[PDB]
């Protein structure tokens, strides 16, 4: 069944102003219930590849 799970990439994020935790929307193989976890238990390695995927210093 879904013993274990595997994360394929994280694709989404969203980012709290008031005080909400900043949430990953990691696509797992398991991706037909995606969830949204936060950065501590989201994979930073995978992190590293959607913070490059970020426009950063324009």
Same mark, same amino acid.
């Given at each position: 069944?879904? &013993?274990? +799970?595997? +994360?394929? =990439? *994280? %694709?989404?994020?969203? *980012?709290? !102003? @008031?005080?909400? $935790? %900043? &949430?990953?929307? *990691?696509?797992? $193989? !398991?991706? =037909? !219930? +995606? $969830?949204? &976890?936060?950065? !501590?238990? *989201? @994979?930073? $390695? ?11 210093? &324009?």
């Amino acid at each position: 069944g879904l &013993e274990y +799970a595997v +994360a394929e =990439s *994280v %694709i989404g994020k969203r *980012v709290g !102003d @008031d005080g909400k $935790t %900043i &949430e990953y929307l *990691v696509k797992w $193989t !398991d991706m =037909s !219930d +995606a $969830t949204w &976890e936060p950065q !501590d238990n *989201v @994979d930073s $390695t995978l992190v590293l590849l959607y913070q490059q995927q970020q426009p950063m210093n &324009e």
